[PDB]
Amino acid sequence: SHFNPRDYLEKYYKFGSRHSAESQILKHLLKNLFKIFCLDGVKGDLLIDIGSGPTIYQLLSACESFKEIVVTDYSDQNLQELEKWLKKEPAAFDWSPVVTYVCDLEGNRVKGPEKEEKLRQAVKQVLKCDVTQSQPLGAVPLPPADCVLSTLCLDAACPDLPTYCRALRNLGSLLKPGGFLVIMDALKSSYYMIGEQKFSLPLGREAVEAAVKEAGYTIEWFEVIEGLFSLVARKL
């Protein structure tokens, strides 16, 4: 989107207007990310974030419940933009607007610099992921994880329903039996849609649930938040 990864961040994540469609949607996603990691007791040692692109907003609550976080992406350019911020380089994107937004949502217990630092301490590995592969992280060896988080990635990463099912199973390979799978994505309606989609309103919920059951997980919680949804599942 926009011209490149950075431009994309500049266009959508500066939080310049609380009423913009983008700020609205971040507010909804972060609200939910907060319930999942901070209210619903999703907790553990190691979390893998799959398809984290150049953004860190999806990890801000998560870094309170997880000793360590591994961020991954299909695109090496997203990863560089990310590292730029992680390593505190001079022309890193300013995350303060979203950071302090989350701080506020968490009850203004910490200010921005403490939340940023907490995230940096938790993130040590930055890795290529490909959801399509048997080994999502190829040759990288990782201890089994307590959580796999994938926000707005695996619906767009998988053209096929079969691939989507395969992907879930491939993601499963990273997880301790009993560990968490946290999916956020859209179920887009048929309106103004060009071409074809792998899921349907209220019915499509039941088909993504079926895909994840079939992939070797149980459904813990599914929440409607375009049809924006959460799905917490546990590996079998």
Partner: peptide, 9 residues
């Protein structure tokens, strides 16, 4: 794309 990230957006 927003809320899809590059290069999916």
């Amino acid at each position: 794309g927003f809320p899809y990230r590059p290069x999916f957006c």
